[PDB]
Amino acid sequence: HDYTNPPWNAKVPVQRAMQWMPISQKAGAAWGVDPQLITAIIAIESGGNPNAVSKSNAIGLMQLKASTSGRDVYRRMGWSGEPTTSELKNPERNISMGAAYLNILETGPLAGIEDPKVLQYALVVSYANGAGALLRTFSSDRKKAISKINDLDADEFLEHVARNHPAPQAPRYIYKLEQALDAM
Numbered sequence: 001h002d003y004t005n006p007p008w009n010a011k012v013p014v015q016r017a018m019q020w021m022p023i024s025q026k027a028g029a030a031w032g033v034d035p036q037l038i039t040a041i042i043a044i045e046s047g048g049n050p051n052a053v054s055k056s057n058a059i060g061l062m063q064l065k066a067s068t069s070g071r072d073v074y075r076r077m078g079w080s081g082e083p084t085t086s087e088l089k090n091p092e093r094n095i096s097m098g099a100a101y102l103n104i105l106e107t108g109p110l111a112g113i114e115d116p117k118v119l120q121y122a123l124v125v126s127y128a129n130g131a132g133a134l135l136r137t138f139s140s141d142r143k144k145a146i147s148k149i150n151d152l153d154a155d156e157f158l159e160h161v162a163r164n165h166p167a168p169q170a171p172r173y174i175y176k177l178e179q180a181l182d183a184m
């Protein structure tokens, strides 16, 4: 299946995502996450609409599900429970939480990925469809998965995701990421 069709035109989504850049820069510097990756994710997830709600109830600029990333980010803060839908519609909270989740993905399940480009692809695919789902396409054992990921360059990683990831959305996300980065 051609994960690049239909083509995704990044101009409008990215330009709108850029209007949130003051928040993304601050969030990014706080969590050690690249503001451009944050901007691309905004463009891709919501096209810059802070009230966006997906069919699976992902919410806001960076489309967080309260029950997954919301819960995990709260945990990382030392809090119980999860944010509300309403709370996820607040731009600052949404972006700061998205940035925190990216940090959680990089420092936890994706720790050990050597090539920064491969890591970037792995992050967006984990963000969109879950780290476990990504890692299990390489191995049931996390260290082995990371090891296998480290054997690939960024283009080979994309190819593996396109061939082996059960979610069709996963490789398309990488395609959109590159479209988005260029519109910046």
Ligand SMILES: CC(=O)N[C@H]1[C@H](O[C@H]2C[C@@H](C(=O)NCCS(=O)(=O)O)[NH2+][C@@H]2CO)O[C@H](CO)[C@@H](OS(=O)(=O)O)[C@@H]1O
Pocket (backbone or CB within 6 Å): 045, 054, 055, 056, 057, 058, 062, 063, 064, 065, 066, 068, 069, 070, 101, 126, 127, 128, 129, 130, 131, 132, 133
């Ligand atoms: C940032 C965030 O909340 N990411 C979560 C992602 O949301 C996705 C789902 C997707 C979505 O809402 N798709 C529906 C698109 S549509 O309505 O059919 O058009 N958008 C969101 C951000 O990428 O779903 C996966 C898998 O459940 C989760 O993986 S998990 O940790 O293993 O549970 C992950 O936490």
Ligand SMILES: CC(=O)N[C@@H]1[C@@H](O[C@H](C)C(=O)O)[C@H](O[C@@H]2O[C@H](CO)[C@@H](O)[C@H](O)[C@H]2NC(C)=O)[C@@H](CO)O[C@H]1O
Pocket (backbone or CB within 6 Å): 006, 008, 043, 044, 045, 046, 047, 052, 053, 054, 055, 058, 063, 128, 169, 173, 176
């Ligand atoms: C054809 C296309 O690419 N449309 C974009 C749309 O993608 C969805 C998945 C679609 O094909 O209908 C995109 O919606 C977001 O897509 C990402 C995955 O790429 C999801 O993680 C988000 O949750 C989706 N958002 C919502 C609200 O469901 C939208 C976002 O604005 O733009 C379309 O260009």
